[PDB]
Amino acid sequence: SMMKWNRERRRLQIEDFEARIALMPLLQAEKDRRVLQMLRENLEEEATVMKDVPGWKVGESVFHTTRWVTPMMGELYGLRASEEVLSATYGFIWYT
Amino acid sequence: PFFDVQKRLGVDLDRWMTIQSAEQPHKIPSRCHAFEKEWIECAHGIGSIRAEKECKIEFEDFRECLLRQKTMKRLHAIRRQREKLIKEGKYTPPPHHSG
Amino acid sequence: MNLMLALLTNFTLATLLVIIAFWLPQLNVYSEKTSPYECGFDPMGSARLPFSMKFFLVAITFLLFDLEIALLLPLPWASQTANLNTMLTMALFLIILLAVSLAYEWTQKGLEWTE
Amino acid sequence: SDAPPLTLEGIKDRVLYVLKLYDKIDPEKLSVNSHFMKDLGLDSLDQVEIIMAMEDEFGFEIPDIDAEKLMCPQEIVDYIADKKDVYE
Amino acid sequence: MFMINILMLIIPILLAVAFLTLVERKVLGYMQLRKGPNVVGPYGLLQPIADAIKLFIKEPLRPATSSASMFILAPIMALGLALTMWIPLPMPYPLINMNLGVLFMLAMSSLAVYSILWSGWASNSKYALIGALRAVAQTISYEVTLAIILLSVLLMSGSFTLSTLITTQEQMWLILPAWPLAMMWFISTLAETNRAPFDLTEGESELVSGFNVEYAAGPFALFFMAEYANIIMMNIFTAILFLGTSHNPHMPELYTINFTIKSLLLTMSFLWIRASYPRFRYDQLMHLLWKNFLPLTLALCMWHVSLPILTSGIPPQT
Amino acid sequence: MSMVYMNIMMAFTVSLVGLLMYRSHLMSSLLCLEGMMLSLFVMAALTILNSHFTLASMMPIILLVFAACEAALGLSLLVMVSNTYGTDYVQNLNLLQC
Amino acid sequence: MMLYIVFILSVIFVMGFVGFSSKPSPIYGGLGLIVSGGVGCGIVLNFGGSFLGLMVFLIYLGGMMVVFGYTTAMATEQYPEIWLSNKAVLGAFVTGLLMEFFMVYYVLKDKEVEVVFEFNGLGDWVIYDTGDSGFFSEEAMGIAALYSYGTWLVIVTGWSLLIGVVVIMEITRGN
Amino acid sequence: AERVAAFLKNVWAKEPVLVASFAIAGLAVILPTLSPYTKYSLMINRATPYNYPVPLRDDGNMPDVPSHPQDPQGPSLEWLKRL
Amino acid sequence: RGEYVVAKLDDLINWARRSSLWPMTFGLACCAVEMMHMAAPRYDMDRFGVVFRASPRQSDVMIVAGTLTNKMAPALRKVYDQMPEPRYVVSMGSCANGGGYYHYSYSVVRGCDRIVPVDIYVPGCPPTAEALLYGILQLQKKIKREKRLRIWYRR
Amino acid sequence: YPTKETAHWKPPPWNDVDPPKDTLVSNLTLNFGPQHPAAHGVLRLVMELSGEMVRKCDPHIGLLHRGTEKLIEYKTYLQALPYFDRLDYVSMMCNEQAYSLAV
Amino acid sequence: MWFEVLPGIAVMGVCLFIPGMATARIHRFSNGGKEKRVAHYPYQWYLMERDRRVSGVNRSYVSKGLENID
């Protein structure tokens, strides 16, 4: 009895994983526009916070390469809402 | 290795875990996969003495992706400037950042 | 967050009951009441003198065996690998050695408490 | 380093000092030759307690047969010398 | 609405613990040809209330030779961790849905042992110390075996999640495929919860009262409440592992009815056993597990790693 | 290096300094050895977890295994030390070079 | 605040290490290593590794129990010491606390403390990854890899543990 | 042939628990080798799609790779459904 | 009147204490046998809330059952002093009461009330298990008449 | 090169074995009574334990010595009969029988 | 007789039923009449976090269906 039910459960998991796979292309597209929208907002504000600093190139990279580098949590959520950040960083780990 | 037996016998005992760009379960990439790949491909074969000078860029970029020091300093400067301007009623928070 | 609140609530409740226990009752303290209890007669020597452990060798073995659960608890996840032939061999190899460890200490009078 | 050697003059101070602390001996008339029983008036047990202090002083066991003869401070100094071989 | 849920969990638990004292006394009474409490309130239903008040208006005393700070920490640490074991229990929805709930309960159970070691050590009595070191010995007996038995079961559930034990048993109880492990798990919970024939740390007949001979009034009450909260909690654990109830999302009440009944009967068996057997000797309790259970537990752990593979019955990872 | 790395490396030093400065008990200096293992375990776990070094996730587990093979070994000598002298004082281990 | 949970836990983590490093009676020393073991399990947990965090806590709980049973046998005296009953233990305990306090003061104010290494006080949350993983725990996958990938590690670890049993039987036999 | 049934019957009357241990342990190490469903176990693990199936660039000479998820080409889990 | 409210708190605490008497496991001589028979099924003292406990610190009543000897007298006082208050003493039988058959002996304390304060005296040699149960039920009536909170109020 | 410090150093034993030390550790001493559930009320059993192993039992009795054998001298042969009901107070008529057979 | 024990077990049994019932109804009360969401893995949390954005009321249990697309 235990083996048939377990075997049935492996097939259910595949049907669950495939449904995820059919959706990932849409979620990837949404995630891209969401990050780029937030990187610009951080860039736009920095222009108004470092408008007077003499030795400052706005939006300058820190890497020598021009490749795309995925932004870390500090960059992406630079000055977002305090509770927005907390759920962005510890939202999953603390959700029980 | 002092005795490179693994190369002689062609058996991988621990080289599968030496670098973080090696093959991982379920093809899970590390955060700094791309940078570690380039440094290793830049510095293959030329030897350590040369790679200390000719592949210096690819290693500084990698060292940035690991500890992110040059990045946190930049953020640190902006935060310092911002809290100064917002201290004397000169910085107006943008809407999304707060509201 | 939710876990933290539950932890903070359970221990706060216990502390209040301990506080209430010591501050609600009427007390009457004197030396002979707070003395150590040894069935009506004064104890001979402090309770801090050495206390021999006749199972010291069994206690040390517990440390070494208690590690095997660290290496064995991943097995439910390990069974999901595509290389089941290797994973099956090492899981049994690890458990078999643990049994050989037990059988060695057992035969050598290790599990027998000293006197 | 090696401790200073025991000398017959060193022992003498120890014995008299120990006797000085005793509260039944009058410090005025306690000479190195004075007698415990006749001169100082101590009784038998008073004599036994003094010998016990000497054991604490020099940290060694004195049998009862010997202490029956240590009737004045001098022989105490002699006895200590004989045990530590302090001919001096 | 989360603070309301916590109160809705701990407050009933204390009430259940209080009335388990009545049930044990009235059950052991009839097995012993007595009647148990029947004078204090109708059928004794007020007996637990009288005892609870009596304890907390009594005089607590710190022995002259005690270590104050540890002497008071132990009862606080005991009861607090006893109520902590309950947060991840699916009934059928846990208060805290832990992904590694089985490991969490294992770890908290180990930590709860130090409320015995520090109480017996802080008391500064010889009977209190003898009992403290019978808990060191008793944990060395079952900790390894109990862990491996859980591992063997989880090789058929697929994950450490407690709520997944419900899914695993949607077609049949786990006691059928794994009745040999249930037998060794039930005795382990007897030993782990310090219950007869394994109630050696307290040992009334040999150590007067064991690690808690110096504890009185409220501080004693916290140990008594903690001990019975484990008795209920572990039998709820046993019901979930081996006698898994069916869950209906539209009628979760029905689960809590069947779930509660199974936990009661498993709890009555604890009282039933305590009235039937003598007490092991704390050195024999060790040889029972290392020389009988451990050889068999290791063999069954191997059998449950191979059985799914050789039958293609490996459960899903999620 | 984030501000957490300071405390874990600060913790390792405290254990290291604790170990090198014996008081009297040998058991007191055995805990410092176990304390150093806990620091290294945490520091490795933060480093490995943060960078998603997946295969390295087994390193901290292997670390604990030999962390306890010393504790077991360390307690074994402590039993043999107290048998000879009756206590685990380190001042009794002065037969050699003296 | 909440964003600095990991830093607060790490402060408590160091305080436990200062606890037993002062070397009071091993009874209290073992208590300190249990408190730091618990919060140390929290810090790893907040970085994603829950299995690792629970494992170390579980393993140290068992180990410190064996130490307790040994303390009552080989490492006990008439008057066990506390952090207040010695000037050496007190002097060391207050020393480690102040040295932690001055580090927390300067890092939280200056935001940049350099002692051998450069440390940044902006906040641990600034380095966390942004994207999600798949339908699994990344650390769980790696620990499962011990058997499919770590064949060499299992063999040495299994062999070492087996000899560990043999070795302690020889050492403690005596006579 | 007369001493094999004397050792076994001696231990079975003195160590019944040990006999059940070795007997159970033996089947764990043997049966997987002899089982015919062990191959399916490894195949089901490969069939669980944890990652995303990144597509390929059609160079024009890949007739074994499907053009749609509902094409005849490619591995099928028909054996799984009937299992 | 505020005195009424305390007079109703006194009833609660008095009820909790007489309803949950916990004697110490303390017997000395033949009378202790009749104390077992009060725990036997016929009388089942446990149904009145009376439960034996071994530890002095977890007990509310000392039932002095048997002869008290000069060698045992220091031990009885110690365990009594180690009972947290409120504490009560029942003197069962004639040896514990006034010396009984051994009043004139040399090694016997003439009455356990020379060592501890006694509340209830149970006569008999031994007092029947039913007689002792009358003593305990009389002790509960004595605890029901306490006015601790009505006396504190009027101070 | 002997110095002030190393004057007292002694050569190590020829075979590397040093003499064992004298009495070091004493068995824990425990009162197993008289107020114990298993001590029958009046048994002060002073024990010396090595852990929980027993090294010596020293039953102290007399906590229930009442002087019956002296109180009997002051009682006629009938007044002394009831004393025997109180010797083995679980076998009353078996004690009475022995005394009756004696008289 | 023995059946006089049932009242004690009935009261005890009713005490173990409340924790299970209180959580089940509280969960549905706080989540608009639906079981509380379970997010054991990052994919599950990503979708749950996405419902807060899609709902527009910062509640991940306020489900927006076909009426919300045109």
Ligand SMILES: CCCCCCCCCCCCCCCCCC(=O)OC[C@H](COP(=O)(O)OCCN)OC(=O)CCCCCCCCCCCCCCCCC
């Ligand atoms: C591909 C790899 C698979 C193979 C794995 C290889 C490892 C196998 C061992 C792993 C488990 C560890 C146990 C090894 C030790 C065996 C037990 C033992 O040593 O017993 C010794 C025992 C000592 O006890 P003694 O004092 O002498 O009392 C009896 C008096 N004669 O004295 C004795 O009595 C010894 C008697 C002989 C013991 C025979 C044990 C047989 C074990 C294998 C049984 C397998 C057959 C059953 C399974 C088949 C399927 C049903």
Ligand code: SF4
């Ligand atoms: S009063 Fe009677 S029954 Fe009790 S001890 Fe004395 S003689 Fe025995």
